[PDB]
Amino acid sequence: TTALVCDNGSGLVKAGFAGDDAPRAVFPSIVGRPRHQGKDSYVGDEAQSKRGILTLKYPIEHGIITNWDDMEKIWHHTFYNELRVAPEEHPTLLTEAPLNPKANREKMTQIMFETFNVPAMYVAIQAVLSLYASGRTTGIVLDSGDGVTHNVPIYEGYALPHAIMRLDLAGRDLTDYLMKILTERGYSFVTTAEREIVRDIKEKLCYVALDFENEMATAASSSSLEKSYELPDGQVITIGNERFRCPETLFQPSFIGMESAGIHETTYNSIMKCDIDIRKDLYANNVMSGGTTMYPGIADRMQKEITALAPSTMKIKIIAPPERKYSVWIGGSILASLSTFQQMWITKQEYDEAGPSIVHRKCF
Amino acid sequence: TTALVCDNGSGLVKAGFAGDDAPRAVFPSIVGRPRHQGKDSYVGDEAQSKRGILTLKYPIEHGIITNWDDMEKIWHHTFYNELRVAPEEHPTLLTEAPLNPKANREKMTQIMFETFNVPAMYVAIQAVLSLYASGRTTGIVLDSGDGVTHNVPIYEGYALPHAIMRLDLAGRDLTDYLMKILTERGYSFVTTAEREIVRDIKEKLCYVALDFENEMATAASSSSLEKSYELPDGQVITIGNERFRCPETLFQPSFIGMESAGIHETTYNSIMKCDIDIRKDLYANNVMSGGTTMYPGIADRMQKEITALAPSTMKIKIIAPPERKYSVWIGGSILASLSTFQQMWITKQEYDEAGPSIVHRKCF
């Protein structure tokens, strides 16, 4: 009777039961298959561990579903193996990326109703769920995950599509970048486990410098910023300025040969695409969500950068929940548990009479 | 499974099943009891026919319920004897007069749920139902019944209470007036059947003169306006100018010693109490409802009178449906049959948890 909540990230799938504090299952959004076959398939952690012999595929690219066969395998796995429930017995809330095409929204709807035979269904924009998680209906969300970074201005519960900004730079790019600078220091990371070590170094030692320039030299004249990382093999290594240099890419994409404005400028740009009367509320409700916004110092650095771009008189406020790795999921969990949401679900009956194009009509 | 629709008029109760073209039962809103007892009671037609030995009571005065014990007897009669259905098996839609006190709305709710054990309930303003009958959500309704005449401006489905005007002159007053002028012509009407004859003369021979003054003299210099009325006893009588003089009271209450503006001025006054931006739409959607607006010539006379009060540039339009005797009822029948209304009913469950004060909250 509990609704299921599934947040399909480019890198990680977060799944669980509506009403729960956190996702019961969090695993890689990967489908693995032996190199030329076309077990015939592996999903998540298992596909990851069997990397050496499989061809891994990510059905979600920059938040958009690009491989429907593989997406269905992930969904099937999520219900049956992770949550261990039959989908036909539960309302299902799925999430989608901002600016998701209408064809993609209908295909998702069709699969859920026709393939998994769900009794009730709903699709929510990820950034909006993060906003709801923070207990707001108006604000601007910065959602930085593994595949994509979006800036989503939301007014009275509805995102403003004309102002949505997408930055195709996220956690995956940061891991690869740390892997490059670490590699040039004389270390070797090329295997799965090694790449996982770099990702672990990133999530544990990395931080956003309040002042990059001043921080850099502080590592030049001292060993004050150097931390030692004990490898799984016992061997210990020293990571220095790569600590703050890797996440800096968010503010200066140029560091990865990327010709794009940083997260601070994109947030301003987005706010500026909104109606004047709403801007003040947006500046005062800048919500951070996603694994990639977990860097210590990011909120303090965004507050400074936005303050510098906004009018002097403007009250800028950054909201960075400690649970933001799962803010999208939590938002869905809250939404699908509300007494008030129970009339919002698309029913099987409704789908049967109007078809998948109902998803757009049903919207709210 | 059909909802019941009951329009409780001061003079006539109109009852039937939602979806039906017209009320299946239309009978006097009277409760009769033998003079000093305090069958112990008679309702409707029977109470009327046993007039000589009973004390008749009208639990509805000028559209407002004033005797709850007697109202319950009418309701009980309506369900069990007229409609011949058990109320606990059907959603019930009841109507109420404009400006009905909140205590009266809650008492009605309490009786329906606690006494008749209805499974679902709703209370609608009579004038709004008449507007819906005409297929509109915006307009100004003139509802003239037996006990009261109201002018109700409605915008986007909601009446504007600050602009509602009540004129305590209606059909009962017109019958009594015709009974007086006919009596002074040398005829005698004092018994029930005689009074019923006058009411029949009123509903069959009376009309609204386009120009009272010019009409009067046309009856002075000719017998062109005189109609003969064949009494039940075979005896035939001649009714002359009383034909147009009796309904004229609507435009000039002074004729009954009443110091009040006529229906035309009250309509203008009401429109004038509304927001400017809405006035144009009101003038263009003047809807007539109730038995008392059935007089031939009334719409043509209202069009003329309103035209004279409104700005020269104003498009004035009077809507006088031929079925207006039952417009309130029909409006309820339509409303309660709409697929869209099915979520609007107050449930027994809702009443049980929140009590009768829910009626105000549930409103729409």
């Binding site: 009403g19 729960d20 504090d21 956190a22 019961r24 709801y132 207990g135 707001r136 209906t137 009275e156 519960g157 939590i330 969990s333 809250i334 939404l335 548990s337 509300l338 007494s339 008030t340 949401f341 009339q343 919002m344 709210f364 | 105000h360 909250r361 549930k362 409103c363 729409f364």
Partner: peptide, 25 residues
């Protein structure tokens, strides 16, 4: 008007009110 707001506004009001979610075990 003592009228409860739109179903969508009731949803927004409840989102702003916030709900306690059950601990994970």
């Amino acid at each position: 008007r003592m009228c409860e707001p739109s179903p969508r506004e009731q949803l927004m009001e409840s989102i702003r009110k916030g709900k306690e979610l059950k601990q994970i075990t």
